[PDB]
Design an enzyme around this catalytic site. Structure first.
Site, short mmCIF file in Angstrom:
data_model
loop_
_atom_site.label_atom_id
_atom_site.label_comp_id
_atom_site.label_asym_id
_atom_site.label_seq_id
_atom_site.Cartn_x
_atom_site.Cartn_y
_atom_site.Cartn_z
CG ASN A 186 -2.03 -1.02 1.14
OD1 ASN A 186 -2.29 -1.71 2.14
ND2 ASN A 186 -2.64 -1.20 -0.03
CG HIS A 188 1.00 3.07 4.10
ND1 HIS A 188 0.87 4.44 4.07
CD2 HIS A 188 -0.18 2.50 3.75
CE1 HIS A 188 -0.38 4.67 3.71
NE2 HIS A 188 -1.05 3.54 3.50
CB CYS A 223 8.61 7.40 8.76
SG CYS A 223 9.85 7.95 7.54
#
Ligand SMILES: O=C(O)c1sccc1-n1cccc1
Ligand SMILES: O=C(O)c1sccc1-n1cccc1
Lengths: 265, 263
Positions: A186, A188, A223
């Site tokens: 995804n 991330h 992050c």
């Protein structure tokens, strides 16, 4: 891999790979943490999930990691087979818990264990929320009804409160950036990257003379792909203890805090 | 995994893992390159090893000079991929290791790879021709007739790669290896360089195209405490010329080319 006879937990065997091992020719803690992800995803898939419920998907709700606690007694060697058993459990409205037991396939002895705490968040607003009964009833049928704890002990390290590191830190690794291999499906940052980033500030002399026994990591903020991270460590202690802090290189916004316990080789 | 009936090649099956896949829910080229390492190491182990007893005595190691990977279909998360590998002598210059990647369910070839290896003294880092005493030790584990993953005359695996001219079109600067990028001997894993080359490809190319071909020359090793700059220029399907160099003096560590197809 497969669900056990009662369908309340999931087991899977893994052969340790050549590129998965460190200098001691045994699996790294990041390889282990990746194996925990793989057995976790296979458990969710084997029971209908894809682990958002029908109602979570309808409400744009996701499960997010708040804490990961890993304790390793023996890291498996390259070529060894490790068997991992995993299960989930409800913790009321706060969220859910996922636990793991790691074993030697040949001896049947417990070589490690882990516990993680998960909360619900709206995917878009990033806002936390207590689990609704409609969502809760959807997954309660896949969890044991009696408490089953990887860390049952009266006073265990998995529930300790972690304090914030005071500047100046004793050690630091500056300017850490995630690459595409650090991203998940995804886009991330994978939660295991943060574990690697925490360990980056441990001095190479500790790394060469000690073995990581315990790691507790709190997850406060994500992050982003284009963010830069600073990894800070201070010794707090035959055993070495460290207090860790991950923050954004710029403003100093906190993303993670943790502790590690190391024992002499 | 296991050696085939003739004991001249090695096969192994792999189930694609959840953390091994990218945004297309298929294995990354770095996951594939790691699977090539794993099947390569298992082949060496099953036959007695890639240092021979004479190489250990002379402090000699095998080093990668070139890696060429061509993927037709990246396997999906949960799919099983079967990989077959074998080695072959190439005279005194060195050895070659080839791979064939297949769909376990259909038996169709979904990818292929070829890598060129040279001998080096691990301490002086000096290259050298393979001696006959060393050569005869491993010739019994290679097929005697040529067996090529890329047989086509004038193929992409043997093309000469030119040096990228400054200014580069795209760049990713200040790349540093972390402990997870190191191997069991504390050297940077050769797959990290592949990831570092791809770092300078723009995200719009990455989101609209699929990597089909990657050829990477290895010139110098990046030490644990070195910083790398990744440079890319479009030369065209999309084609790119790549250069990895040390952030400081600009010393070259790698050069390569990638071929990408519209999704
Ligand atoms: O990151 C995740 O989504 C998953 S899935 C199961 C374990 C983990 N995890 C979290 C921290 C380290 C590993
Ligand atoms: O790096 C290595 O030592 C091995 S072992 C077999 C394949 C590779 N490799 C080299 C470049 C990318 C993969």
């Amino acid at each position: 891999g497969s669900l056990t006879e009662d369908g309340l937990s999931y087991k899977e065997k893994f052969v340790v790979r050549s590129y998965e091992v460190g200098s001691n020719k045994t699996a790294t803690v990041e390889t282990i943490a990746n194996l925990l992800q793989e057995v976790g995803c296979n458990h969710a898939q084997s029971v209908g999930f894809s682990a958002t419920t029908t109602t979570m998907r309808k409400l744009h709700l996701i499960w997010v990691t708040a804490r990961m606690h890993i304790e390793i007694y023996k890291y498996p060697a390259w070529g060894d087979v490790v068997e991992i058993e995993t299960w989930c459990q409800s913790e009321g409205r706060i969220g859910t818990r996922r636990d793991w037991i790691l074993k030697d396939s040949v001896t049947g002895e417990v070589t490690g264990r882990a516990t993680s705490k998960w909360v619900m968040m709206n995917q878009d607003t990033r806002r936390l929320q207590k689990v609704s009964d409609d969502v809760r009833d959807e997954y309660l049928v896949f969890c044991p009804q009696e408490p089953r704890l990887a860390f049952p002990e009266e006073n265990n390290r998995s529930l300790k409160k972690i304090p914030k590191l005071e500047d100046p830190a004793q050690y630091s690794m500056i300017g850490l950036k995630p690459r595409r291999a650090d991203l998940d499906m995804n886009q991330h940052v994978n939660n295991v990257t943060y574990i690697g980033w925490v360990l980056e500030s441990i001095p190479q002399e500790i790394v060469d003379t000690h073995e990581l026994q315990v790691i507790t990591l709190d997850y406060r903020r994500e992050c982003q792909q284009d963010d830069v991270v600073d990894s800070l460590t201070t010794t707090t202690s035959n055993d070495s203890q460290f207090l860790h802090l991950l923050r954004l290189s710029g403003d100093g916004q906190e993303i993670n805090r943790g502790t590690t316990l190391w024992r002499k080789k």
